[PDB]
Design a protein around this ligand. Structure first.
Ligand SMILES: CNc1cccc2cc(C(=O)Nc3ccc(C(=O)O)cc3)c(=O)[nH]c12
Length: 196
């Protein structure tokens, strides 16, 4: 199946030359760019008028989650490639959320839409299983939590609050109307960014 082959070549490509996709993997810039890429996806959903709140969280285990209250990534199985439209978005190259997926040792996807909660787990960009319904809900949105591969990233491996805060504040400025929360579980620090 062409599609599976393609996807794995893409993932492999990104892990072999991460500099070409995420930036420097020693100085922290690439590592923080992982967060910004995921956030940019949530910003699109806000720009489209479906997302009002985005929540960025620094977890104690040095992963980062991004939650929006948008529509939820479509979950219906694409006829054309045999898996959830969400998995296509998470894995197909073109920088795209697939790059962050490729360079994460684990990624967790939680989608709320059409009354159902769906969940999928990825490792180094590869799904452990197809997207599956775990429950019901009245809410909508997309939550992506990722744990960056320490095979890829060295030296600066811990997320730095201030670096995330500066960029998220910039993004709220550029995208007037979007409301962004940043919360650090390591010490309870939090901020709310919202402009005009
Ligand atoms: C944390 N959030 C987050 C992380 C990473 C990727 C995405 C991707 C989307 C997205 O693709 N939404 C979307 C919604 C509806 C439809 C439709 O046709 O109904 C098509 C696309 C998103 O909303 N949020 C994301």
């Amino acid at each position: 199946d062409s599609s599976s082959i393609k996807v794995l070549k893409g993932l492999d490509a990104v892990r072999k030359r991460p500099g070409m996709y995420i930036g420097d993997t020693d100085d922290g810039t690439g590592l923080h760019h992982m967060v910004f890429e995921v956030v940019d996806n949530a910003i699109d959903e806000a720009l489209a008028g479906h997302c009002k709140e985005i929540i960025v969280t620094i977890h104690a285990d040095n992963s980062v989650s991004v939650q929006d209250d948008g529509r939820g990534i479509p979950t219906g199985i694409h006829p054309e490639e045999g898996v959830s439209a969400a998995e296509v978005i998470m894995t197909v190259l073109h920088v795209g959320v697939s790059v962050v997926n490729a360079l994460s040792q684990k990624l967790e996807l939680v989608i709320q839409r059409e009354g159902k909660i769906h969940r999928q787990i990825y490792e180094h960009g590869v799904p452990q299983a197809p997207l599956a319904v775990t429950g019901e809900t009245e809410k909508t949105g997309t939550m992506v939590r990722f744990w960056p591969s320490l095979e890829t990233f060295t030296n600066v491996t811990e997320f730095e609050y201030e670096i995330l805060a500066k960029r998220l504040r910039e993004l709220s400025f550029l995208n007037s109307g979007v409301s962004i929360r940043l919360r650090d579980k390591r010490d309870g620090k939090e901020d709310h960014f919202h402009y005009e």
